[PDB]
Design brief:
Far-red fluorescent protein, mainly beta, globular, eleven-stranded mixed barrel, 56% strand, Green Fluorescent Protein, fluorescent protein, monomer, 224 residues, pH-induced cis-trans izomerization
């Protein structure tokens, strides 16, 4: 009866194109969904080595592995067995735009992700296309219910060679494949996360990536 257990395995398939460079990746990983932790081992299977920074793909590689505290209704875990989808636009402040759409299903006890990526207008001499990035700062997503699904918003900061940062803003739409009558919706809430590259090999043809994510309400005193 409980479909999301203490330990879960994932398989992912990704395809897309950034500034007209086509690529595919696959990954395998494991996580602890109630701890909010996960690791993936990713391989670039076509179009490698990537002539752009792997960091721009990092958020496209898993919302079942968020630790929902304070009894926050969990839209993602509640969605099984049917699963859920997400669609996102990421807008870089230097004009790069990356759109991604994802399906999450559960098949034979394994989480299955299918991701499609389209990135356009990354500046040809910018840090993404010149591979001058160094991973992501920790970030906070705000989630709120809208039209029977959830919307998500975050700003994220990309570390740069030299010590600067390039900021991007994410708008995400989350939709459940389970009927609305069988789901308990959350109110507005927040997810804090770290997204970390653990190691890479051969010009990021092999990447190991890790996330920790925890969901919470705003715990500051209200006067309302």
């Amino acid at each position: 009866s409980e479909l999301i257990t203490e330990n879960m395995h994932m398989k992912l398939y990704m395809e897309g194109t950034v500034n007209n460079h086509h690529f595919k990746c696959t990954s395998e990983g494991e996580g602890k969904p109630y701890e909010g932790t996960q690791t993936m081992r990713i391989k670039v299977v076509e179009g490698g080595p990537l002539p752009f920074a792997f960091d721009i793909l990092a958020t496209s590689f898993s919302k079942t592995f968020i630790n929902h505290t304070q009894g926050i209704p969990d839209f993602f875990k509640q969605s099984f067995p049917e699963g859920f989808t997400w669609e996102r636009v990421t807008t870089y402040e230097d004009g790069g735009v990356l759109t991604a759409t994802q399906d999450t299903s559960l098949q034979d006890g394994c989480l299955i992700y299918n991701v499609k990526i389209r990135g356009v207008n990354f500046p040809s001499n910018g840090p993404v296309m010149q591979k001058k990035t160094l991973g992501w700062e920790a970030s906070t997503e705000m989630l709120y219910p809208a039209d029977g699904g959830l919307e998500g918003r975050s700003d994220m900061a990309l570390k740069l060679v030299g010590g600067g940062h390039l900021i991007c803003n994410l708008k995400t739409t989350y939709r459940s494949k389970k009927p609305a009558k069988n789901l308990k919706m959350p109110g507005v809430y927040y997810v804090d996360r770290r997204l970390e590259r653990i190691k890479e090999a051969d010009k990021e043809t092999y990447v190991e990536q890790h996330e920790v994510a925890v969901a919470r309400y705003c715990d500051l005193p209200s006067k309302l």
